[PDB]
Symmetry: D5
Subunit: 165 residues, 10 copies
């Protein structure tokens, strides 16, 4: 699937950036670290705390030369639907990262986070080096959400270590 010290698998699909469908490849973010951020499904009963917590902290990822690509196995019309759902109605509201649609579940399968029996992704966070290789693989089972200071600490750290050692 997606070994850490090997090359990250390619992702490509219709994302939602700034309220519209953009059909984004991984190669659009060449020269950047990638933070590939799988959340399980759209429109959930729980409040989308971690993806709003990444979209609000998107400046901290623009400063570290990286792009957070939030992936789900849902179709891009549902992504565009709950980005356009107001945040007080359980929706996202303002969303400032590519909400990538892995409707064929090829990206979630290649990153080992696909729950094949239920067709959704594990709560996953993958930090791809700007050489294209994976470097970090935080995979949570469906309850526990990811944290943004954890991703920023590891992200940077990879930045400082790729600079010096």
């Amino acid at each position: 699937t997606a070994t850490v010290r090997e090359a990250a698998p390619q992702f490509s699909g219709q994302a939602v950036v700034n309220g519209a469908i953009k059909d984004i490849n991984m190669n659009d973010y060449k020269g950047k670290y990638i933070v590939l951020f799988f959340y399980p499904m759209d429109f959930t009963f729980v409040c989308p705390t971690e993806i709003i917590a990444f979209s609000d902290r998107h400046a901290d990822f623009e400063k570290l030369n990286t792009q957070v690509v939030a992936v789900s196995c849902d179709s891009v019309y549902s992504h565009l639907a709950w980005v356009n759902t107001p945040r007080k109605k359980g929706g996202l509201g303002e969303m400032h990262i590519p909400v990538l649609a892995d409707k064929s579940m090829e990206i979630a399968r290649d990153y080992g986070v696909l729950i094949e029996e239920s067709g959704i992704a594990l709560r996953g966070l993958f930090i791809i080096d700007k050489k294209g290789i994976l470097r970090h693989s935080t995979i949570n089972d469906l309850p526990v959400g990811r944290n943004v200071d954890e991703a920023l600490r590891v992200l940077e750290a990879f930045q400082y270590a790729d600079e010096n050692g």
Copy 2:
């Protein structure tokens, strides 16, 4: 996959009946004809004409001892989301049939309507005999929607022919 004169493959999953998730098996509708009605994806830019046209005409399927199970490869939270979307906002509104969630795309694969490259279903309509065997297989490519008088004519006809000959 799903040959006509052979037995229909089983479907089982979390549907949306009357505004909530019901976790419906095919065996819930034993003794009925099944009209398994694949629409491609949720929240589309086109108005959902054919599924509203089946949900409004659900009495014509209750009279012919059959159940229309509208399937999509989307998750049940998106189904519950756009059933609960008001109909003037491009949504469904009142939905009076099981909106079955084939999120693992196992039902759409078994019925040969799965578009594996894009993870959605072909516009499909399958009439399963109440012996469990398939009898009718109307599969459209993604533009052309199904009609309800066509399904009622074929449905009945199968009813009259299973009665007499």
Copy 3:
């Protein structure tokens, strides 16, 4: 066999057009939609209602830039025999579409309508795009016959959607 969104399989054989054998390939109707119309066998005890209902309505298919190719797994001598059988004797009479003979059952096998145990075709209707790809697949089990207004509605619709969207 014959997937919808894929390319339609080629058909080629001795048909009956206007009372004689013509040895017709699919490529004779390039640039047209094809309505490949499987009826099960010749000389049946039931009256041939659906094939007479397509042959009488052949102008409605000439207007929509399509050709209805009625196929059976019977040999072309039986096709020529019951086209030449008068219509009051249970026969066809005037027949204004290619009555294609799939005696080797290669066309009915490639279109998934061959009942291999009995050597006949399912009641099938397939609408091939004039790019050669299939678009529509109406397969009935042997009782219920096809309707012509259904085929005209779907046919057109494919016409309007291939024009605009």
Copy 4:
């Protein structure tokens, strides 16, 4: 397929005896020699000389304790159709042998006379011993028809040799 000195393969299907469909198995003629007589297809432009020449000489096969089962790869409705076609119109007329319908082409395949490319049978004549084993295999290519005095000579001969030696 059907070796001579081995056991003849079983045949079973809907025949036409005395103007109706009878659904005849090989086991109906246990204790008799079988003369399994493949003619290629129904309603041919040539006059059906050999099958009328066997049906008129059916008493010579009733006297030698054998049954001539005329087989074609056509369906039983075409068989019933051209038995009921008057003999001056190129048809059979009176037909006094089982006109067996091998529409699935399983009998013609098991007897090695199936022309798989065209779906018809070779002009074949097979004399099965009343032990069920084959004894004689006259296979003609499609021009040259079988003769009845040849079949009677070989038939008998098998009769005299199975009696004495």
Copy 5:
């Protein structure tokens, strides 16, 4: 083995023509119909009625542009031995056709008449077209011998049909 409508397999071996060994290939008789005539073995207790009946009627095969090649699975020394055996001592006497020795049983295996358990040939008669393809396949089990008027009727018939139709 030797299908009718396909090409006949090649035969080549030491025959006995006019009292001596000639080492005859099939290609020696190019441009002729071949009547390949398997008799089971030499020096049998029964009188060799059918091979004397072909050798005496060899003019009727020279007139129809064909060559009767009598084959057995015996060696050419036994063939030369019982051609040279006088006819009143159970032998052949005058023999006016190639008595081909299939001692390796390669010709009888390729023509499907080899009885592999006993190493002899079935009583077989095969009419090869002068295009080299088989056209006729009369195979008898070991009791019943072939007739010469049957072979002449079928032979001719193939001649008239290859001329006209």
Copy 6:
């Protein structure tokens, strides 16, 4: 290897607890969450910051009903050697967790963190549920070390979610 939502693979080997070799199985910690903590190799030139940071914070893992099992692919004599190396000499000093020796590299292979070319483990942290299934999989490439507040946050969280939801 070690999928998250599946069962964690078993680990068993000679660890170093409190300055001696204990030969510890996974089943010794049944009824606890496991925090399986791969560090790459012993005696490294970098200061062992993360394993001292887990051993000093071992009370925070004893309070959350879990056991941190620090694994390396080094032998237990090297583990006992650099636990017994004083901390000012680049060593561990006080070590309050099982320093498990995966010298056969079977535990690191089963947890997907084995770098097979160099025989060491990726910087990995795996949180096994006390049902024995994996729940969390933090894998770093060799530069970036793990953090203890991250493991405590995720650990707990799994604790609160396994309690309630």
Copy 7:
């Protein structure tokens, strides 16, 4: 095939003893050494020197508790034919050993003397122990015939060595 120090393969077939067909198995000569004596074919142009030289010296094999079974790949009717051919006409005349017919060439194949391309046997002589195992294997290519004093010397010798050592 037939290794020496292993068990001899079984032979069984229609032989010619004293002027008639006897259908002889190997088990008829249990408790005897067997001298299985392949000569190539019947009715040869060369005088049958070695088989007459064994049949005239048959008393020397009856005295050493052995049976010479002369085998050829010819049929038993040819064997009976040239045993009954007078010796001045190139034939055998008096023949005092089983002239075994290996017409299916199963005995010559099992004894490795079958020339598969020409269907005859190598000039072979095999001495089977009365335990059933082979002990001696003299195989000549087709020119050079076997000698009887050689077979008697080896035969005996096997007799004296099986007695003492």
Copy 8:
């Protein structure tokens, strides 16, 4: 292995000619018949009667343009040892043929005389034509030794038949 009518397998190894090791290939004796003479092993308790009987009669093989190559599966030091053992001490004494050492048992395996369970050769005598093909294969089981007048008779005979016929 070593079929008679096929080509003899090559032999090559360290022989003993005239009291020393010579490393002899089969190609050293091109243009000669070869008499490849396997004896089982060296230094046996029985007196080496047959190999002394060939070495003393070596002039009778030099006159017939052949070379007797005595082979054993023993090493060339044992061959040189019991050629140099005096003949009254159970040894060979004067040895006038190549005593070939098949210590790897490749020559005895290729000539089918290797007893694989005990690593020795069967008492074998093989006459290779000077075209390189085998012609004669006398294989004895371990008791009965070969005779020299038998080998000379067969040898010659092959000589006279290769001259004339």
Copy 9:
């Protein structure tokens, strides 16, 4: 083959003990260490220094509860021959260990010392524990012979370590 820490393969064959053939199995020396001592071949031009150096020092192996089994791939008649060769003639003379004959080269193959191309053994020394497992594997290429004080040192050492540790 023969791994050290695994079980030693069984050896069994005709040895030479005290001037005669004894047919010795490995199980004859159960409860002893085995020193399996491969020397390459018999009667070599070099003086047999190492095997005489083991046979003269056999008391030092009787004292350490072990048995030195000198193996070669030569037959037991050559072993008996050069044990009976006087020592001033390049022979062994007094030989006080089992000179085991691995003529089938099954023992040398199982102990990995067989040189398969030349059929001899590598100069090998294997110390089997009296549990039957191998413990020591000294394999030399053909020049350099084994030493007896080396084998005694390692042997003992295994003795002291199997006693204590």
Copy 10:
């Protein structure tokens, strides 16, 4: 693995020479005999007697044109750690040979001394010829250590025999 008379497998890895990591290939010592000296693991409770006994006697290996490469399956940081451990604390102290780190256990696997279940090497000593082929293979099970006078005797001996014979 590593056969004696075949070519030695290549070794390459980070060694410890004179207190630092050198990343040494086998090709660094081309033109020398190699003494590849596997000891099982680092920091053992037993005193490292054999590796100190080789490092102190390194002049005796520099004089015989050979290099002793002490290998273990431990990582090079542990090797550098216990070379730098003082010898009175159970460590090595002065170490005058390449302490090669086979952390991936590829060298110990290729030399057949890897104990795969425990990930350590057997006590092994391998003398590679300066042609690169192996010549000597002393493998001990884990108790019994190697001796230096044994290695020097065999080493030389290989030296004298590669000079003369």
